[PDB]
């Protein structure tokens, strides 16, 4: 269990990747 917790917080840091890189807010020049 000391384990799953180091894993759990791991899967999130990769889940955050995907979601940050593929679901980010657009950088547009519409301005």
């Amino acid at each position: 269990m000391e384990t799953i917790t180091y894993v759990f917080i791991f899967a999130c840091i990769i889940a955050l990747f995907f979601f940050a890189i593929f679901f980010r807010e657009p950088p547009r020049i519409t301005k």
Binding site: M1, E2, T5, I9
Partner: peptide
Amino acid sequence: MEVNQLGLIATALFVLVPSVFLIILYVQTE
């Protein structure tokens, strides 16, 4: 092995509070 079980609760709340916190604010934003 021997670990202090309070760590879990500590380390889980660290993950949630500040996170929950920010989760509330990103919704009010939209």
